[PDB]
């Protein structure tokens, strides 16, 4: 009886094993576009992914994770609200059963079909496991997906999903360029929050891009053919792996743009 997204183990249950679920800086949140304040002191965001080294893709039973070599400064996030250098370690998505839900953040209560999280850790803490113990340990770049035109830079991900259908399966995933998943604009909202899965640690600087990327219906359909279960277990489609919006409490969402 471990955590997940079902009726019996989903987000309303997590607080029993992870009491920080009801904490002061939980994620995701609703982004109220009329309450977020433009902050002219926010520096521009620096996404430096030209030397990114992807290694592997893994079905972890919750989502699929594309992992990078983070043993040197090869793909880094800097600037915006961040002090110092954050190294890309992995990305993953959250998505829905239907096009009208799937994102974790919402924008004026609007739910997108999916959300991409590009996870980075603060290199002043030396490794990812130390960085998650610090209030400024992580920076997650959140990008919304809407269903429309295909995203060409997503298709290499979609085409490998058949090879990692079940929990615990991995596949070699070299030479993938995460620059193909970005929208044109790097305009963003930022706030202090948490991991959106157990252990729900309050270690994240959230940077959520305003502009969604477009993916095709056929692209998201292939996400929804994944399984939460292991090989040889009863099939449970990997859908609706999103945590809903948490109370904003004593926090301010800042906008990089007027």
Ligand X SMILES: COc1ccc(N(C(=O)C#C[Si](C)(C)C)[C@H](C(=O)NCc2ccccc2)c2ccc(S(N)(=O)=O)cc2)cc1Cl
Considering the rule CB under 5 A, would residue 210 count as an interface residue with Zn ion? Answer: no
Instruction: Tokens for 82, please give them.
Output: 């961040």
Which value, in Å, is the radius of gyration of the alpha carbons in the chain?
Answer: 17
Report the nearest approach of ligand X to the CB of residue 185 (Å). Answer: 21
Considering the rule CB under 5 A, would residue 105 count as an interface residue with Zn ion? Answer: no
190 is in an annotated binding site: no
- Catalytic-role residue among 1, 2, 34, 62: 62
Closest CA to 25 of 117, 108, 134, 110: 134
Considering the rule CB under 5 A, would residue 117 count as an interface residue with Zn ion? Answer: yes
Number of chain residues interacting with ligand X (CB under 6 A):
18
User: How many CB atoms are located within 10 Å of the residue 233 CB?
Assistant: 11
196 is in an annotated binding site: yes
Question: At 154, is the secondary structure helix, strand, or coil?
Answer: helix
Name the binder of 19 from Zn ion, ligand X, none, CB < 5-8 A by kind: none
Q: Which of residues 192-211 bind ligand X (CB under 6 A)?
A: 195-197, 199
62 is catalytic: yes
Which residues are 119's β-sheet partners?
A: 90, 140
36 or 119: whose CB is closer to ligand X? 119
Report the nearest approach of ligand X to the CB of residue 133 (Å). Answer: 8
| Cα–Cα separations (whole angstroms), residue 238 to 91, 213, 219, 230, 241 | 17, 21, 14, 11, 7
92 is in an annotated binding site: yes
166 is in an annotated binding site: no
20 or 150: whose CB is closer to ligand X? 20
**How far is the C-alpha of 207 from the C-alpha of 88, rounded, in Å?**
14
Report the nearest approach of Zn ion to the CB of residue 34 (Å). Answer: 26
Candidates 45, 47, 75, 119; binder of ligand X (CB under 6 A) is 119
Per CB under 5 A, the segment of 5-13, 109-117, 222-230, 244-252 that binds Zn ion is 109-117
Burial annotation 175-186 (CB, 10 A radius, 16+ → b, else e) = ebebeebbeeeb
197 is in an annotated binding site: yes
Which regions of 69-159 does DSSP assign to beta strands (E)?
Answer: 76-79, 86-95, 106-107, 114-122, 138-147
Name the binder of 122 from ligand X, Zn ion, none, CB < 5-8 A by kind: none
Q: Which residues contact 250 (CB under 8 A, 6 or more apart)?
A: 24
Q: Which of residues 7-66 bind ligand X (CB under 6 A)?
A: 60, 62-63, 65
End-to-end CA distance of the chain: 47
**How far is the C-alpha of 237 from the C-alpha of 226, rounded, in Å?**
6
Q: Which residues bind Zn ion (CB under 5 A)?
A: 117
Annotated binding site for Zn(2+): 92, 94, 117
Give the catalytic positions in this structure: 62
Q: Which residues bind ligand X (CB under 6 A)?
A: 60, 62-63, 65, 67, 89-90, 92, 117, 119, 128-129, 132, 140, 195-197, 199
């Amino acid at each position: 009886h471990h955590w997940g997204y079902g009726k019996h183990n989903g987000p309303e249950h997590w607080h029993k094993d992870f009491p920080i679920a009801k904490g002061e800086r939980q994620s995701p949140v609703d982004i109220d576009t009329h309450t977020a304040k433009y902050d002219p002191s926010l520096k521009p965001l620096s996404v430096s992914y030209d030397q990114a080294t992807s290694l592997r893709i893994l079905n972890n039973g919750h989502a699929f994770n594309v992992e990078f070599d983070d043993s040197q400064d090869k793909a880094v996030l800097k600037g915006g609200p961040l002090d110092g250098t954050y190294r890309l370690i992995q990305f993953h998505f959250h998505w829905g059963s239907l096009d009208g839900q799937g994102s974790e953040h919402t924008v004026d209560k609007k739910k997108y079909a999916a959300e991409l999280h590009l996870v980075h850790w603060n290199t002043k803490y030396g490794d990812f496991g130390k960085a998650v113990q610090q209030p400024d340990g992580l920076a997650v770049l959140g990008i919304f997906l809407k269903v429309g035109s295909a995203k060409p830079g997503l298709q290499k991900v979609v085409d490998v999903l058949d090879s990692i259908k079940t929990k615990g399966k991995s596949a070699d995933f070299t030479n993938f360029d995460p620059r193909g998943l970005l929208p044109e604009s790097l305009d963003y909202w930022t706030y202090p929050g948490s991991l959106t899965t157990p252990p729900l640690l309050e270690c994240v600087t959230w940077i959520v891009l305003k502009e969604p990327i477009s993916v095709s219906s056929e692209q998201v359909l292939k996400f929804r053919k994944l399984n939460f279960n292991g090989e040889g277990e009863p099939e449970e489609l990997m859908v609706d792996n999103w945590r809903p919006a948490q109370p904003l409490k004593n926090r301010q969402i800042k906008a990089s743009f007027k």
